[PDB]
Amino acid sequence: GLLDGKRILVTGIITDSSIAFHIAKVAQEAGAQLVLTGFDRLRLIQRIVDRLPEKAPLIELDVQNEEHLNTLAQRVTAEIGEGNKLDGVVHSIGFMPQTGMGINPFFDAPYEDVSKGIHISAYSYASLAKALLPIMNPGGSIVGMDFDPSRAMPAYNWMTVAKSALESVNRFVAREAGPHGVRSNLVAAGPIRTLAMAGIVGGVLGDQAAEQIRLLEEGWDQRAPIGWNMKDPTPVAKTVCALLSDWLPATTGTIIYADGGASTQLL
Numbered sequence: 001g002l003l004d005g006k007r008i009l010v011t012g013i014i015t016d017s018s019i020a021f022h023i024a025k026v027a028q029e030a031g032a033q034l035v036l037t038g039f040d041r042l043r044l045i046q047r048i049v050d051r052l053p054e055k056a057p058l059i060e061l062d063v064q065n066e067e068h069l070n071t072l073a074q075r076v077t078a079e080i081g082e083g084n085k086l087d088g089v090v091h092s093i094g095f096m097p098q099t100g101m102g103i104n105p106f107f108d109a110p111y112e113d114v115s116k117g118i119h120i121s122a123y124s125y126a127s128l129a130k131a132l133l134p135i136m137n138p139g140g141s142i143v144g145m146d147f148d149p150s151r152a153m154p155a156y157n158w159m160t161v162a163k164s165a166l167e168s169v170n171r172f173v174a175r176e177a178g179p180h181g182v183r184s185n186l187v188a189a190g191p192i193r194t195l196a197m198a199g200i201v202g203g204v205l206g207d208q209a210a211e212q213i214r215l216l217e218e219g220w221d222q223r224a225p226i227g228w229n230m231k232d233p234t235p236v237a238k239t240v241c242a243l244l245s246d247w248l249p250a251t252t253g254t255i256i257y258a259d260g261g262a263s264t265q266l267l
């Protein structure tokens with residue numbers, strides 16, 4: 001298998017539609033041995049982890065908790081065994097309070113809310129790398145999830161600002177990881193109907209926010225030369241696994257687009 005013998009930590013499972021659930025599933029089917037992390041609802045997440053192809057341990061990680069981060073490497077080592085190291089780390093973590101995602105105008109998001117979203121969505125990519133690089137093997141790989149923020153998307157407002165910060169953080173993490181023999185890259189996915197996003201397109205932040213995301217989704221499918229399936233994150237999961245493998249060993253600090261090609265076309 002593509003990831004035979006690799007030990008990979010995967011953050012970000014909260015539902016069975018989470019991108020991270022599919023990353024974990026595909027990675028296990030490709031031979032990887034996993035450690036999962038979960039935020040807050042650990043019993044809920046454990047029952048989802050129980051549905052993965054193979055048994056894998058779940059440990060707690062709130063990326064806003066300094067003690068969780070400062071103990072993370074030790075707690076991972078407790079699961080994989082002293083002397084064993086990680087080959088891969090997946091950041092699949094995002095959050096922005098509703099005030100920053102269209103329930104009110106762009107200008108009405110208070111900084112306390114924006115700062116919380118940037119903490120979880122962007123700064124924590126550096127936090128996670130800081131915590132785990134000391135227990136990573138040369139040849140290893142850190143991968144984070146991106147949503148192309150090169151143009152303003154009124155569908156996502158301050159989450160797009162957070163992704164712009166994340167892309168910058170990724171390039172600096174590549175610099176830190178390099179001397180360890182470790183790569184850092186982002187996978188920019190098209191829109192996926194995770195439970196949170198299905199709620200927004202469904203109307204939970206109001207009619208206008210629902211229509212804005214729906215228009216974004218519709219344009220995406222029109223632009224993508226190979227199509228885009230918002231109800232199936234498997235192609236995104238495979239792309240993450242490609243970057244976790246040994247097959248892109250000279251790629252670091254970059255963004256790989258798993259978006260059906262929609263970012264490359266203008267209609």
Ligand SMILES: NC(=O)c1ccc[n+]([C@@H]2O[C@H](COP(=O)([O-])OP(=O)(O)OC[C@H]3O[C@@H](n4cnc5c(N)ncnc54)[C@H](O)[C@@H]3O)[C@@H](O)[C@H]2O)c1
Pocket residue numbers: 011012013014015017018019020038039061062063064092093094095120145146147188189190191192193194195196197
């Ligand atoms: N859904 C999409 O359309 C889409 C598209 C491109 C990229 N992405 C990105 O993919 C990543 C995964 O999101 P998703 O779409 O699978 O949604 P999701 O809601 O299933 O996953 C987001 C995860 O972030 C976790 N999280 C939030 N606060 C946290 C904290 N304090 N500590 C640790 N974890 C925390 C949640 O518990 C959840 O597991 C995010 O970075 C998201 O921005 C999503």
